[PDB]
Design an enzyme around this catalytic site. Sequence first.
Site, PDB file in Angstrom:
ATOM      1  N   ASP A  35       6.434   1.915   9.671  1.00 25.01           N
ATOM      2  CA  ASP A  35       6.109   1.299   9.558  1.00 25.01           C
ATOM      3  C   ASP A  35       4.578   1.289  10.087  1.00 25.01           C
ATOM      4  OD1 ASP A  35       4.391  -1.736   9.403  1.00 25.01           O
ATOM      5  OD2 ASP A  35       5.051  -2.018  11.567  1.00 25.01           O
ATOM      6  N   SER A 199     -10.771  -0.320  -1.562  1.00 23.26           N
ATOM      7  CA  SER A 199      -9.943  -0.197  -3.139  1.00 23.26           C
ATOM      8  C   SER A 199     -11.742  -0.272  -3.768  1.00 23.26           C
ATOM      9  CB  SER A 199      -9.189  -0.443  -3.420  1.00 23.26           C
ATOM     10  OG  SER A 199      -8.859  -0.943  -5.006  1.00 23.26           O
TER      11      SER A 199
END
Length: 330
Positions: A35, A199
Amino acid sequence: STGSATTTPIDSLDDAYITPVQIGTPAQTLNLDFDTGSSDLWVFSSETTASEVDGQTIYTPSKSTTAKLLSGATWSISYGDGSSSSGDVYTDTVSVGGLTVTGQAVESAKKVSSSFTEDSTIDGLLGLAFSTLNTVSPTQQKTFFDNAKASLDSPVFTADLGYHAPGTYNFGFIDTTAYTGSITYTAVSTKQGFWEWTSTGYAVGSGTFKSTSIDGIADTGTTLLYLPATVVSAYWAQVSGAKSSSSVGGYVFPCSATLPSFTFGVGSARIVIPGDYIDFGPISTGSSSCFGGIQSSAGIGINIFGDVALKAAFVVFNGATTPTLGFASK
């Protein structure tokens, strides 16, 4: 040193991925959820409340000759999905795919929340976010990657998650045969303890690319792709019959519909998520309504590039003095 381990989806939908981990001496092999959105290595154990164990493999510290109680230490975590767990702490030898750390903090669960009990395939978590998020008190502990880092050939690990198939986590090296083209690296902020990056934009299907900054985290421990409501609305508008269902708790669509791809930007580069990666199947057995794999992050407070996005790429988690993230197509 290096390590390399195969990671396997827990079910036919890729809801999560499990990776075998050797703990203790003699080795006790548990299947952990790697994770990159958390920083605790915790396990089902001989100490877990009996009624909260339902098919998981447990770690028994008393059977490990290298286990040592970390005296006074406790841990307690709650995850973004409302699940939780807590307990005490041992140090022990932990190996992943040939790479061994001695003195790793292994957090033994005394209590786990229902969602963990109900998932027989996940024996615990291995956190790979930054050690600043680790919950051990009074002395915060380091992640497996942080402990291994200085010994690794290169201070990196890579995630290569499969679509409806196994993939690979590598430590200490970049497998140049595992991706196409080049790896584009992008800046990371560690201010919130995550692999947080920005992004450069998105496209829906064959549509034109929208240049816009989307700050979010690369999180292998989250199944879906959670993005701003504007972006998500633009995606599902291109799926006939799709709608947001408050009762279901997100966008659903008829499976007779064709899902467009979703492209996200990494600098000037582009990662294309095929439409099929966005289908998470019937909301209930026999239903013609399918759950979508791109959902709104509104009210999460952060955008999450979860498995839906990451499995479309070869992802480099670069733990250099100034960490960065790399993405390649594959």
